Every structure is written in C-alpha cells, then in structure tokens.
Amino acid sequence: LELTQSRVQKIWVPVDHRPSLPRSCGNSPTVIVMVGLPARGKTYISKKLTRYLNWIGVPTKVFNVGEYRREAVKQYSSYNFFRPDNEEAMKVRKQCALAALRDVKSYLAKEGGQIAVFDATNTTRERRHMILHFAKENDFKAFFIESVCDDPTVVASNIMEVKISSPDYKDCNSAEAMDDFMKRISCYEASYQPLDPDKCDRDLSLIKVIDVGRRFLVNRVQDHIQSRIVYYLMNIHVQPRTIYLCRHGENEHNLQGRIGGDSGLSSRGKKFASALSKFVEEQNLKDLRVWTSQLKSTIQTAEALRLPYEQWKALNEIDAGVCEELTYEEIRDTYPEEYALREQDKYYYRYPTGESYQDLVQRLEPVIMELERQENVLVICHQAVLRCLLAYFLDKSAEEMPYLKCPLHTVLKLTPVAYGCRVESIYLNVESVCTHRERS
C-alpha cells in the first residue's frame, strides 16, 4: 500500500507508477432555477448564493436572461417590450432564454462548472417544463428557488435600490423608471403560475422564500448542496447593518517578522487597541457583537473596548505547522523547497502539519454563516483569516485571496448595498510594521 505525499497540498496519494503508455480517465451538476415576478430579489439571491458557493469551492455561475436580452436588443425603450401581445419581443426573449440555457450546458458539461443559476422570471409552468426537459436530457439536477412577496413597500424599495439604477434606465429619471418598472411587473402577473408543491410541483426540489424570508416552503431536498443552500437562505437577512473587520493590534512576533505563535500586543498594538475603542464609540452603534480568535493578541485588542466579546477558535490564524514562530528568512533557509512551493501556489499550499488558505475557508464557513445571521459585528482577527473573510464579502477568487491587502491598525468597514459590499478603509493613525508580501 505505497503512498506518496503531494508536495503542495500534502495529500497522501497512491504512488503512481504509470505504465509505458500513461492513460488519463478524462457528482451530477445542478441548474438552480430562479422563479418569481420582477423586483422579488431573484438577482440578489442569485448573486449572493453564487458568491457563497464559489467561496466554499463549488464552481458557480449566474446566467441572467435579461443580460442576454440587453446584448440582443441594443437599447431599452419601455415596458411595451415585455407586453404579452408583443409577438416579436416574445420570440427574442425566448431565444435569449434558450441561448442562456446553451451556455448553461457548456458551463456544466464542458467547463467544470458545478452549479448554474438560471436567473429569469420562469413564472409559467411551460417555461419550467422546458427547463426540466433541458435538465433531464443533459443529466442535470434541477432545484427551484421561488421568491414570493405581495408587499408593495418591499417592491417599491427594490425598484428604488437596484432597478432604477439598471442599464435599462440610464436615460430615465427615478420617477419614469419606477413607473415603467411597475407596468413591466404587470406584464408578468396574468401568466404567473406560482410553484405548487402540493399538487403540480410535488416531485420538484424547491424552496419558496415567502415575504422576504419570513417563511419557507421546502420540498424534496435531494442532496448536500441543496440542503446547504436552504440553510444559507434561512440565515441571511436584508436588515441594514455594518461589518467591521480588523486584525489584532501589532504583536511582538510582528516586530521580529515571525509567523504564527501566540505573542502579545507591542506598545503600538496597545495604542491601536485604545484607538479602536475610540473609533467603535464614535460609530454610535445601538448593539455591536465583538468576535476574536483564541489567540492573545486579538483578545488583548478586544479587552481595550470594554465590550462583551466572544472568542472563536475558527478565527485563529492559519496554522503554519513546522514553520510556526519562524521568520520568512528562516523558512527560506531551513525549508527552501517548502518556501518556493508556497510562493508558486499560495492558496492550495499546505504547511507541513499545518494549513492552507483552502483549509481556512472550510474552518471559516461557520463564521460566515453566523456573520450572515447577525447585524453589527466587529471581527478582530489575523492577516490570512481576514483575507479569507474579505474574499467572501468582496467576491474575490481563490487565486486573489492570499494577496488581499489587510494592513495592521486599519478597520475595514463593510456596508451591504445593492448586490454586494461597499468597503471603506479606516486607518487608526498608529504606526506598525508591514506584514504584506506580494507575489513573485
């Protein structure tokens, strides 16, 4: 039972003594079907879910039928394009949906994609029967996500927040765009057949998000990924809030250029901790949850706030294994092969008896799920942990993630707006060393 440890990821694999003529061999993908009237947050759900799935390592892509339409029909004039009696535009819209499905097939069967989010109204049983036929013929699973809401306040808010600012309404003022969009919604209301898990859609795998996540109808969750999506949708919310992310104040290891360890705050780190308390106070937040790692430097930083805080072992810095408490110079001199391997593949590289950024993502997933549930949160953590969390909020790839700039004594203020996060950086005017290292 001869095994070898892969140099980058440190995975034990069978020793592969390929024969004279080495031969390469060259689970089922899922089509997530968005369902609902316009301004029901389908694009918001599509984008957020795709961001989460990609971050956890499930290759996911959104196919928005409206973008195929904006490409086929140069400029948008009015709701008249969406009229059920508009024979020509109805043909164009069908062609756009079919062209998106063609790209869904290519993504899942030929590009290594695992999940395709089909972002359209898909309000009629006919359209959904056609998507099911497409899924069955291509051996793709189908999972439906319907967003149902009758509240006019919610509809008006969605139009104001992200519809009026759509490329379709570039030449329009807020009032014209709102009026045109209401008429556009009305075009879909007559033919709209909601999902019926009771009789018609009984055998379909679906989630009905009712009244902006107040209630859920979950039918036939087949697998792990659908179960995860359902859990995610139940944990996220659209309530306004702020996420503050920062590292512990400068520590003794930072001064010596040493990685890992459990060293305490330097004199400057203690100054940052005081500066952070003043900053937090000036934010005047009704309630604020404070999260730290179990490492001393983040706890000492939180201690300066005089606020209750919760320690998470999942927030502990990346484990450097045998390289813990060493400087990067000592790593290069004692472990040159290891140093070069990491520089070449920073995301997947695992330290011996240690971790990779890939392991960090797996550890941080419960942190992300809890961050989603919460409102105002301050996370006091570490450089690699912060890059991973930031890659989730900022939709950064696995390749970009180990190189994100997360300086010491700097708060990253995250405000959820439109289809992602607005990021503000706040340097708290306390000197520190620089721990950022660019690629080679």
Ligand X SMILES: N#Cc1c[nH]c2ccc(Oc3ccc(NC(=O)CN)cc3)cc12
* Phi, psi dihedral angles at 224 (to 5 degrees): -60, -50
Smaller CB separation from its own copies, 113 or 354: 354
Q: Does 350 carry a binding-site annotation?
A: no
> Among this protein's residues, is 248 annotated catalytic?
yes
> Among this protein's residues, is 96 annotated catalytic?
no
| Residues of span 3-42 touching its own copies by CB under 8 A | 3, 5, 10-12, 14
| DSSP conformational letter for 160 | I
Catalytic residue among 96, 149, 323, 406: 149
Of positions 165, 235, 327, 376, contacts its own copies by CB under 8 A: 235
- Token readout for 268 is 């400057």
> Among this protein's residues, is 317 annotated catalytic?
yes
* Residues whose CB is less than 8 angstroms from the CB of residue 100 and which lie 6 or more positions away in sequence, other chains included: 63, 64, 65, 68, 118, 120
* Residues whose CB is less than 8 angstroms from the CB of residue 348 and which lie 6 or more positions away in sequence, other chains included: 8, 9, 356, 357, 358, 398
Smaller CB separation from ligand F6P, 376 or 435: 435
Beta carbon of residue 149, minimum distance to ligand X (angstroms, whole number) = 3
Query: CB 214: neighbour CB atoms within 10 A?
Result: 9
Q: Residue 359 interacts with its own copies (CB under 8 A)?
A: yes
* Phi, psi dihedral angles at 167 (to 5 degrees): -60, -20
Smaller CB separation from its own copies, 131 or 209: 209
Instruction: Give the separation between CA 146 and CA 271, rounded to whole angstroms.
Output: 50
Q: Does 339 carry a binding-site annotation?
A: yes
- Mask: binding to its own copies, 47-86, rule CB under 8 A, as x and -? ----------------------------------------
| Residues of span 300-319 touching ligand F6P by CB under 6 A | 317-318
Instruction: Give the separation between CA 244 and CA 426, rounded to whole angstroms.
Output: 10
Of positions 31, 62, 209, 384, contacts ligand F6P by CB under 6 A: 384
Beta carbon of residue 321, minimum distance to ligand F6P (angstroms, whole number) = 10
- Positive or negative, the CA dihedral 268, 270, 273, 277 is negative
| DSSP conformational letter for 264 | P
What is 283-336 written as a DSSP string? Answer: T--SS-EEEE-SSHHHHHHHHTTTS-EEE-GGGS----GGGTT-BHHHHHHH-H
Q: 311 near 381, Cβ under 8 Å?
A: no
* Helices 383-393 and 42-55: angle between axes, nearest 10 degrees: 150
Smaller CB separation from ligand F6P, 21 or 434: 434
* Residues whose CB is less than 8 angstroms from the CB of residue 20 and which lie 6 or more positions away in sequence, other chains included: none
Q: Residue 196 interacts with its own copies (CB under 8 A)?
A: no
Smaller CB separation from ligand F6P, 125 or 405: 405
Interacting residue ranges for its own copies, rule: CB under 8 A: 1, 3, 5, 10-12, 14, 197, 214-221, 223-224, 227, 230-231, 234-235, 262, 264-265, 270, 273, 294-296, 299-300, 303-304, 311, 313-314, 324, 353, 359, 362, 370, 373
Annotated binding-site residue numbers for ATP: 36-44, 158-163, 339-342, 383-387, 419
Interacting residue ranges for ligand F6P, rule: CB under 6 A: 259-260, 317-318, 320, 382-384, 402, 435, 437
Interacting residue ranges for ligand X, rule: CB under 6 A: 40-41, 44-45, 147, 149, 154, 158, 209, 212-213, 233-234, 236-238
Active site residues: 119, 149, 248, 317
